[PDB]
Write a protein that binds this DNA or RNA. Structure first.
Length: 904
RNA sequence: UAAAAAAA
């Protein structure tokens, strides 16, 4: 007859439970929807902002080019900047930045594009693609149709308005950088910037996007960090900058810096403040054979200040000096009146024909991205780890000027952060073996708040631990070009013994009385033809002659060896299916009982144990009452591009008991690059069921929750229409062949989590009354108290969505997870869903904390991450040994561990 | 690769 209809779920209620407090969010209300009756919101609370963005018709033009966005984008501003006629309209014309161009005015009124439908203008083709009324943005803001609201969220008018706001932001007399189309960095004396790695600084910018809320339209702003190449003597803030922002800083001045910096971090106690300045013989070898700066110069765009907005980039470094060039110093001394201070320095060339100039007089064009991998992660991370009070100021102080400039017509109580209501849910009860941890609310006075969703294992034991003493065997992977100190054998024997003794107190009996085994030269296959290295050769031997009941503890000499870790896991997990944990020597050797205690936590899980769970009452609400059979909780993630241009990897994990303590799973190569919809996710449902029925006397789950991670909004329709349908259709098929031939169609709810978003919260109060009148803390570490639930004011018009911030934000300003129930066959109220979401954040079994997203999702991410090591590990080989089959790129794991959390 | 958290 007719196919069935997988429609995205409409919101049906709001939650009620929890301690109430208002909080602020980084949103501004632009407008109240047109379909909201004037007799609804006070005339004073409606934002006094009108303008073009409310009531305008925008010309749009499709536009082809002749490829890198760098060139196109650069191409457009060039026209917009090198023509005194168009320049006047440069706050009214915007790039998409590949397909279209938006303009407040028509482009056919320009004596420029005559024959596009002066020389550079020939790489563009214009085609008027209609007009866009911007005022329809403010239309269906009450409409309770999840399909309409979808088409509204990812709409042309929304993209137009956003992109035209960018135009306004960009038209200021201040120096301003556009990065990836929507991130703007302003480089004035008030900017937040620190020197970064080599020849670079970090800079705090901002970005805006607009989100539809119920009746109607909000603007969201958040700060963004980016690295750039240093183009100034001094960085903003420094008082030597306020005086001369334009104090001479040539290309040479930059290379010296990079020299000092490079050696000061590749050698220690180098100290540039003492170290003798390079006498130019060093400094020529450097700038040619040293990738720490060659890669940066390769392409670096420079200025020629001695010719009196055209930056020639570079090609490389010549061989001839500034003196041995016939003369150059004579040219510049006579014909430009300048004395070359480093005339022995090799010169650079800026392409043909013969346009060659010395670095000593060649300034660097601002705003250039600092290409490379971040290696100084600590600096990068600390730069952005700002607490909410400090971070909301920053957002306000970078955004508001630009936004005010944007929202006024091309010739202040409204610009303030939305205040929304929140509710703080109680933490569940954490269960250990014979003990509990329930946070009891208390006043903000002492630092008591900091313990909600943040305990430790002290005076506690794991719930379930291996029955038998098990054999723990050290293998010292010696991933270094030098043999380890003599005092390491003794140091490790010490460490192993203490480790075995500490974890006994948690309930884990290890027999550590083996003898540690050293493996030098371990590493990935190497050269087309590769042959296995030692001591992979050594290790392999070791692994196929491994005793029973043996847990491998890999002690890495140097941490951070991506290539080594991937292999150790590839060989031990995938090939051999042997239980193993890695540990980094310089940590392990400190012998912290806290370090050791966080390590067994993983090991225990791997040995099928259980560390902490929820209380007996808490678990009751993930149990179907109708069958006294727990719910099958699934998590799935998708990671993209494991290498170069390769197929994405999907994973699915699932619970199997009523304790929700263990989540094995399976992973799978997608059949395309950057494919986010797991089109055949149902095939992975087969093991979820088989191990479920194993731990439930042969019965199949009667309810199913599917937590789907990492989808954007445009994909919600397909998650429901393709993935949920696939799950449903699959269990309907696998069901019968598992329960004795009977009909199987359990109801599934599906909740997508988006844990990376642009929504932030700042607390307003230190305390708030609970329902008994007792004043009680509602913030911890200067962030909103975990878990503040927010489902009003900034949530969608029609979808069943809510924010919950489940974790203590130990650093910076925490990021709440945005949950959307996309599909629901078991009539779940918001109070129900919000509680199990928050609750599931307390049974992440490798940390003593509540985490920022339900355990199933974190587990699914970790599994995707591990599948990526397997992929990456055996890949160079699979490019040689060869398009390639799925199970040779990403093989299945050994059957031994198909039902363990080897990814933990 | 002890761990949660903050940045991409």
């Amino acid at each position: 007859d007719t196919h069935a209809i997988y429609k995205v779920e409409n919101r049906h209620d709001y939650g009620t439970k929890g301690t109430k407090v208002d909080i602020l969010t980084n949103h501004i209300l632009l407008a109240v929807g047109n379909d909201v009756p004037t007799e609804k919101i006070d005339k004073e609370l409606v934002p006094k902002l009108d303008g073009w963005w409310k009531t305008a018709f925008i010309f749009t033009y499709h536009i082809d080019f002749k490829l890198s966005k760098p060139k196109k984008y650069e191409l457009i501003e060039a026209l917009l900047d090198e023509d005194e006629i168009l320049y006047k309209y440069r706050d009214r014309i915007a790039f998409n930045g590949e397909d279209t161009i938006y303009s407040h005015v028509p482009l056919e009124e320009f004596t420029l594009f005559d024959g596009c439908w002066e020389e550079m203008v020939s790489q563009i083709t214009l085609k008027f693609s209609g007009k866009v009324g911007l005022k329809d943005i403010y239309n269906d803001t009450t409409t309770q149709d999840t399909e309409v609201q979808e088409s509204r969220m990812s709409a042309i008018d929304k993209t137009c308005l956003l992109s035209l706001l960018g135009a306004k932001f960009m038209s200021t007399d201040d120096l301003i950088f556009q990065v990836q189309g929507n991130k703007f960095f302003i480089f004035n004396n008030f900017a937040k910037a620190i020197p970064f790695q080599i020849g670079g600084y970090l800079l705090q910018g901002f970005t805006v996007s607009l989100t539809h809320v119920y009746g109607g339209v909000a603007l969201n702003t958040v700060s963004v960090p980016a690295p750039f190449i240093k183009h100034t003597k001094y960085l903003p803030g420094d008082p030597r900058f306020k005086n001369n922002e334009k104090e001479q800083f040539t290309l040479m001045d930059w290379i010296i810096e990079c020299y000092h910096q490079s050696k000061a971090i590749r050698d220690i106690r180098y100290n540039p403040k003492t170290a003798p300045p390079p006498s130019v013989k060093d400094l020529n070898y450097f700038v040619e054979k040293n990738t720490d700066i060659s890669a940066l110069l390769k392409g670096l765009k420079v200025y020629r200040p001695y010719i009196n907005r055209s930056s020639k980039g570079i090609v490389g470094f010549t061989r001839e000096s500034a003196v041995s060039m016939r003369n150059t110093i004579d040219y510049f001394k006579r014909k430009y009146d300048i004395t070359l201070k480093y005339p022995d320095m090799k010169l650079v060339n800026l392409g043909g024909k013969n346009d060659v100039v010395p670095p000593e007089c060649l300034t660097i064009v601002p705003g250039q991205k600092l290409k490379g991998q971040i290696f100084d992660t600590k600096t990068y991370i600390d730069f952005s780890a700002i607490r909410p009070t400090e971070k909301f100021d920053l957002i306000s102080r970078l955004s508001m000027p630009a936004i005010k400039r944007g929202l006024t017509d091309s010739e202040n109580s409204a610009y303030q952060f939305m205040r929304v209501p929140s509710r703080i849910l109680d933490a569940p009860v954490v269960q250990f073996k014979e003990s509990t941890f329930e946070y009891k609310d208390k006043s903000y006075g002492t630092k008591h708040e900091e313990s909600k969703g943040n305990w430790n294992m002290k005076g506690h034991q794991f719930i379930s631990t291996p029955a038998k003493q098990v054999n723990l065997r050290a293998i010292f992977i010696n991933n270094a070009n030098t043999a380890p100190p003599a005092s390491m054998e003794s140091e490790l024997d010490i460490s192993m013994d203490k480790f075995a003794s500490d974890v006994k107190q948690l309930g884990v009996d290890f027999n550590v009385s083996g003898k540690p085994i050293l493996i030098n030269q371990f590493g990935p296959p190497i050269k087309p033809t590769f042959e296995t290295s030692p001591g992979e050769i050594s290790l392999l031997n070791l692994l196929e002659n491994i005793p029973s009941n043996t847990y491998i503890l890999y002690v890495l000499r140097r941490g951070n060896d991506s290539a080594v870790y991937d292999r150790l896991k590839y060989i031990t997990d995938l090939k051999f299916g042997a239980l193993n944990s890695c540990v980094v020597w310089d940590n392990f050797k400190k012998n912290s009982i806290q370090y050791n205690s966080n390590v067994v936590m993983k090991m225990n899980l791997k040995l099928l144990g259980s560390n902490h769970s929820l209380s007996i009452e808490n678990n009751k609400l993930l149990i179907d009452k109708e069958s006294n059979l727990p719910i099958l909780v699934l998590g799935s993630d998708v990671t993209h591009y494991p290498e170069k241009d390769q197929n994405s990897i999907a994973s699915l994990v699932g619970s199997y008991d009523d304790k929700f303590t263990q989540f094995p799973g399976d992973y799978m190569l997608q059949d395309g690059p950057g494919e986010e919809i797991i089109t055949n996710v149902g095939s992975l449902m087969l093991n979820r069921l088989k191990i479920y029925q194993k731990h439930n006397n042969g019965k199949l789950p009667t309810k199913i929750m599917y937590f789907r991670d990492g989808v954007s909004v445009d994909q919600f329709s397909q998650v429901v229409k393709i993935e949920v349908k696939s799950i449903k259709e699959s269990v309907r098929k696998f069901g019968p062949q598992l329960n004795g031939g009977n009909k199987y169609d359990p109801p599934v709810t599906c909740i997508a989590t988006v844990k990376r978003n642009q929504v932030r919260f700042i607390p307003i109060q230190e305390n708030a009354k609970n329902e008994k009148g007792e004043e009680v803390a509602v913030q911890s570490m200067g962030n909103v108290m975990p878990g503040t639930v927010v489902d009003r004011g900034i949530t969608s018009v029609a979808h069943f969505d809510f924010f919950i911030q489940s974790h203590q934000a130990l650093k910076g300003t925490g990021v709440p997870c945005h949950y959307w129930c996309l599909y629901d066959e078991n009539q779940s109220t918001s109070d129900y869903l919000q509680e199990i979401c928050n609750n599931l954040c307390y049974i992440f079994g490798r940390s003593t904390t509540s985490v920022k997203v339900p355990a199933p999702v974190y587990y699914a991410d970790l599994l995707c991450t591990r599948a990526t090591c397997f992929f990456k590990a055996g890949f160079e080989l699979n490019m040689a040994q060869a398009t390639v089959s799925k199970n040779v790129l990403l093989p299945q794991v050994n059957d031994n561990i198909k039902s363990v959390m080897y990814y933990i």
